[PDB]
Motif scaffolding. Structure first.
Motif, short mmCIF file in Angstrom:
data_model
loop_
_atom_site.label_atom_id
_atom_site.label_comp_id
_atom_site.label_asym_id
_atom_site.label_seq_id
_atom_site.Cartn_x
_atom_site.Cartn_y
_atom_site.Cartn_z
N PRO A 1 -7.03 96.20 68.05
CA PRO A 1 -7.68 94.92 68.29
C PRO A 1 -9.12 95.02 68.79
O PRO A 1 -9.88 94.07 68.62
CB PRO A 1 -6.72 94.19 69.23
N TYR B 1 -5.30 88.73 60.99
CA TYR B 1 -5.17 88.97 62.41
C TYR B 1 -5.58 87.73 63.22
O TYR B 1 -4.89 87.33 64.16
CB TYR B 1 -5.99 90.22 62.80
N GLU C 1 3.66 97.89 64.36
CA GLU C 1 2.75 97.51 63.28
C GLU C 1 2.82 98.53 62.14
O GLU C 1 3.05 98.14 60.99
CB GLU C 1 1.33 97.40 63.85
N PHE D 1 -3.11 97.23 62.16
CA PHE D 1 -3.11 95.80 62.47
C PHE D 1 -3.62 94.96 61.30
O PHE D 1 -3.76 93.75 61.46
CB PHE D 1 -3.93 95.55 63.73
N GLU E 1 -3.02 84.96 62.96
CA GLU E 1 -1.72 85.26 63.56
C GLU E 1 -1.78 85.41 65.08
O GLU E 1 -0.74 85.30 65.72
CB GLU E 1 -1.14 86.50 62.88
N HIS E 2 -2.94 85.71 65.66
CA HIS E 2 -3.04 85.97 67.09
C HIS E 2 -4.00 85.00 67.77
O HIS E 2 -4.55 85.31 68.82
CB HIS E 2 -3.48 87.41 67.35
N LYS E 3 -4.14 83.80 67.21
CA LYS E 3 -5.12 82.84 67.70
C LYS E 3 -4.95 82.64 69.21
O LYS E 3 -5.93 82.66 69.97
CB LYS E 3 -4.94 81.57 66.87
N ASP E 4 -3.69 82.49 69.65
CA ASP E 4 -3.39 82.08 71.02
C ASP E 4 -3.71 83.17 72.05
O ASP E 4 -3.68 82.88 73.24
CB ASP E 4 -1.96 81.57 71.13
N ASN E 5 -4.03 84.41 71.62
CA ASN E 5 -4.48 85.43 72.56
C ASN E 5 -5.84 86.01 72.20
O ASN E 5 -6.28 86.99 72.83
CB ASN E 5 -3.44 86.52 72.75
N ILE E 6 -6.57 85.39 71.26
CA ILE E 6 -7.90 85.87 70.95
C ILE E 6 -8.92 85.16 71.83
O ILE E 6 -9.20 83.97 71.64
CB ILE E 6 -8.24 85.74 69.45
N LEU F 1 -4.68 91.17 74.45
CA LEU F 1 -4.22 91.83 73.24
C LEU F 1 -3.95 93.30 73.56
O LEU F 1 -4.55 93.85 74.48
CB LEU F 1 -5.26 91.69 72.13
#
Ligand SMILES: */C(=C\C(=O)N1CCC[C@]1(C)C#Cc1cnccc1-c1[nH]c2c(c1Nc1cccc(Cl)c1OC)C(=O)NCC2)CN(C)C
Ligand SMILES: [Cl-]
Ligand SMILES: [Cl-]
Ligand SMILES: [Cl-]
Ligand SMILES: [Cl-]
Length: 308
Positions: free
Chosen positions: A145, A98, A301, A92, A101-106, A286
């Protein structure tokens, strides 16, 4: 007792460039040790010198142990046209990328857990007399994650039995992550790593903002001397921001110890929504290895520095 295992070039298949930058060039590959049908995804690093990368190998081999969850482990080295370091692929990538790129699910639970894990990794290194000197979100890697590891030992120094500090020469260093005393006096300690840890935490809580964006590195010591610091990230409640502010105290011995940071962030991770305020937190997910379909994510990945 620091050993370096030499891996034969012929044991690596499917080598492909992954990225290049300040850290050199990193490739991914499959390592098939002779006398095994096991195929191990690896990352492979070279600089752009042979000596520089061997210094990194030395540090990494010195600090490895059986129980080492949060610091990258050297699998070995390969001698080709270059000297290369070999490690387990972190599919990852790095945590800086990370979080962007994954703000909306962190969610809050992920951010606090990452803080705990980085602090555990740093406490481990401190116990082994290692001053990292380059802790940053760019140098934390994501195995899953839920599981991160500290990397890049290019600047790291082992302290002698009687030594409390490392005094540097005139090499390029990451000013915006550095303690004031490191900028002014080229002094580095465990407590200067704590400053860098606070900056790293800020990077995570802003989902990968650049610290002191648009401010020249030459101005940082004056900003710090005036009492100015990185701003409070909007998701951070006051107790989280105060940890960061304590990490950036002028007096190095007043800053938190990694041991204390483990405890405090662990406390927060037990009630994460109390400490970070993220819209839609409970609805975020995640990939996790306990998921039936985690293997899907894996295949998908796997597939800063200025002269002082
Ligand atoms: C971080 C992103 C980043 O590092 N990326 C983006 C795609 C490729 C790349 C370069 C990677 C990777 C990677 C994957 N698995 C394991 C390690 C690494 C790695 N990345 C960096 C370092 C890594 N560590 C390595 C790699 C090979 C061998 C060894 Cl022994 C080892 O440990 C030292 C590293 O040392 N420094 C930083 C990058 C954001 N960008 C860094 C800005
Ligand atoms: Cl954790
Ligand atoms: Cl390096
Ligand atoms: Cl202060
Ligand atoms: Cl910088």
């Amino acid at each position: 007792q620091a050993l370096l295992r030499i891996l034969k070039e012929t044991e690596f298949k499917k080598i492909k460039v992954l990225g290049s930058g300040a850290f050199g060039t990193v490739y991914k590959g499959l390592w098939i040790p002779e006398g095994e049908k096991v195929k191990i995804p690896v990352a492979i690093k070279e600089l752009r010198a042979n000596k520089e990368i061997l210094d990194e190998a030395y540090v990494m081999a010195s600090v490895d142990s059986v129980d080492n969850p949060h610091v990258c482990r050297l699998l070995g080295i390969c001698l080709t046209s270059t000297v290369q370091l070999i490690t387990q692929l972190m599919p990852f990538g790095c945590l800086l990328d990370y979080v962007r790129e994954h703000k909306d699910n962190i969610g809050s639970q992920y951010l606090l857990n990452w803080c705990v894990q980085i602090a555990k990794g740093m406490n481990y290194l401190e116990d082994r007399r290692l001053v990292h000197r380059d802790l940053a979100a760019r140098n934390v890697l994501v195995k899953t994650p839920q599981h991160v590891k500290i990397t890049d030992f290019g600047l790291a120094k082992l302290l002698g039995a009687e030594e409390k500090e490392y005094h540097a020469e005139g090499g390029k260093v990451p000013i915006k992550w550095m303690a004031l005393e490191s900028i002014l006096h080229r002094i580095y300690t465990h407590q200067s790593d704590v400053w860098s840890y606070g900056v790293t935490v800020w990077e995570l809580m802003t989902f990968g903002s650049k610290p002191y964006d648009g401010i020249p590195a030459s101005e940082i010591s004056s900003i710090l001397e005036k009492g100015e610091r990185l701003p409070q990230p909007p998701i951070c409640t006051i107790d989280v921001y105060m940890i960061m502010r304590k990490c950036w105290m002028i007096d190095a011995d007043s800053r938190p110890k990694f041991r204390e940071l483990i405890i405090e962030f662990s406390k927060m991770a037990r009630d994460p929504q109390r400490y970070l305020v993220i819209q839609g937190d409970e609805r975020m997910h995640l990939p996790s290895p306990t998921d039936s379909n985690f293997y899907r994510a894996l295949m998908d990945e796997e597939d800063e520095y200025l002269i002082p």
